[PDB]
Amino acid sequence: MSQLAHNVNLSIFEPISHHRANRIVCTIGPSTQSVEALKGLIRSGMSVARMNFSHGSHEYHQTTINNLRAAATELGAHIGLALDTKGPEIRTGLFKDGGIALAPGDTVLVTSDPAFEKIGTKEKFYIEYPRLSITVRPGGFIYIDDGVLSLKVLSKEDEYTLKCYVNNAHFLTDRKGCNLPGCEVDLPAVSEKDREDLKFGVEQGIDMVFASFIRTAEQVQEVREALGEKGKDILIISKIENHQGVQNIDGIIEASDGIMVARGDLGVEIPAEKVVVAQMILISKCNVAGKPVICATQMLESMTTNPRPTRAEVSDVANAVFNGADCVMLSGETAKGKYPNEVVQYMARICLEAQSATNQAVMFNSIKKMQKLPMSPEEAVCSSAVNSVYEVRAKALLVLSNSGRSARLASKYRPDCPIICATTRMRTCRQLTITRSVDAVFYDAERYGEDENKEKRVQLGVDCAKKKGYVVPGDLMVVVHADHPNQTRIIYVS
Template structure:
């Protein structure tokens, strides 16, 4: 149940910005400009680019992080079991009423027309999914290019060397090589992790990425497969479940329990369930993530027109603001920054939209209360933190010590009205926290004892917030210190008290 309406302080932003790096944004100079414009996290799309190219981008992103003094979360996005049309000699405009014949790649008979060359009103195409004919039937819809092209299956030849699917074009459009294919309601006979995905996963571990996004998640078993592969490599990288299938929506609770975070991947999800249903499910997914205490990212076409225009449409600005009001932890840019003409302007615009949306307390998504305190003592501490903050108007910040990052994740979900500074001894934990709502991560060696912890708090409050002696901050963490204990310590602390108590 909502109990208050948090508003981000004027000098900070709650929701974070995740941007995809690509040809338009992979140079050292542009990455530095993106960070200056407000970038909090980087997405690397493993569907494009080889490992050498991606490694160079990662190195530049980490260099920009070091130069700015602000941690960046780096996310590797696996391609997953996406099926595609094969290679075409050139883009071709499909017209309504045309018939296409789709065969598995390499299965065309000798002397048959080449893919992409219409013959007698029939356009031959290929797909990289050999099982297509076994999984569709007459009357079924098949969508290409994120739903822009609509096909209706008319005939299926499922067996033999000439296995194929015939379909009539209901809604045409320009078809290009390797265009994505969606078949709503059909679970493909493909593993959660392809050989390419496993190779990319190993690369992500070698490069020290902070998050791994798993595409086309159907259930918790898909996430366990990714976690098992990471465990085998000795990695504790956090796994983000991309929610983009109807199957995932049916299994949302189990996915939330198995994931370290979720992404509302609205492109493929919209093809699966219809665009009119996406806003409803966006809010439901965000709410489910908040209940499960995992961060949520809203993605796809948020400022799409900025691929080729210096300013977004009013509808796009409203889309970003509504995601913020729904309560998302982060919003994501894709083509806008990867291949667009205005990558830096897109990040700066998203920063301004978020800040403006968060200025109005009557509009900001309310924090949540309720739940079972006895089930999770650390969560009850986070509610106690919020109570102290709300009951003491002079509190300047919450400063949380964490080993695993869990304390920061707890407090982030409570949407404090003051800055939340998360102090982490491990760089990986610090970087992961950069994706959490309202959290300012700071690398901090573990203090030896409580007195040392409070002296550290004083130093951080002065350096990060400009606090003077007497300013109030809430200190939270787990004791005994440095042992990974659950969050069980809270103190309303006046800056300078530790020094005075020590006789300095």
């Protein structure tokens, strides 16, 4: 049938019997750094904790790491740990008396001539960007101090200098970050700080990396190389933040393990109505690729200080889910907000509402129709297992995958039931936290043996399903595992 037919037969006041398939990423901040606070978040619905490396030293983040692992252990929970890189930046230079006041209607010259690095004035100051006047055009814009100060470029004065118009009052201070909307800029894939930070990330055993400002496939390869051999199993989620990213998404997807749609960042460069559509394209492309996609920024912002969001905000979360996002991310709302638990709980409810209003069969059919023939054995087995779920109406799907690969492959086909992955690696448990539908369960092969005939992982998988209330004796499950991940079975729960 169809989404159209799903909508018209929907009873919006009947209870939802579905279980939450989407996953929530939370930013850790002052509101939420303690063991207790982190437990609250875990109980509320957090799957992944995001360290924002734009702020805070290594020891700040070490605290997040330690307290998160203490909390997760207490609760018997696998939580993903994500390092979100600062990324390259363009900074202003210095000012006399450490700052300057600008007024709506003033002109100010901005220059890449270093002679002005140390000596900025209301009238002229330095931006650390050698190709400034090859890059930014007249009528173009520059934003400074997290997008707060807006300058309209009036004209090119010389090869180092632009004349600008001040659109709003701001008091500008030493070495602020700059925005150059609409420009191919000459910045590296990773900064030197990024390099130190990724190194730290690898030493601390992070699960995934949110790579800032990704513009090309090669830049992703640079993050891969940075992480090096020792971090070859850390996932890279490339953050798409601008027109180049959106333009290069096919290659970036190929190179990455996943994508983050940074809506607010995109919205600096691109008309809002085109960010909406970019979000759709980017999400659909990841679905088709079977790679996790995370929707970030501008999510339930107003809930940072209010106990309830606007409907518009709620609708925007819903729609990311409808779009096909695995995950939705919270920023300030958990990092520094008044209601971190409540907002996470509320996200969970919204997700669940939208899940229930989606016809999953339609997306399954849609992904399926993208598949070229012949398929590889591994695609065939996973898409065939999902097809079996719909056909016999199974209430859970169990995959035995040590790396998580098949869990991701299954998920990509959008079964209308939960996916359980029995794995021998805790790392796989933490990394599956960004994959829709999935509950990872850890099989301890050191304790219980190698389980060559699978009997013990199947049984663990089934017990997990029973204990979360997905199945009871008499229900059907589909099980995917290796022979002596290419075997499927259809079983009754006993």
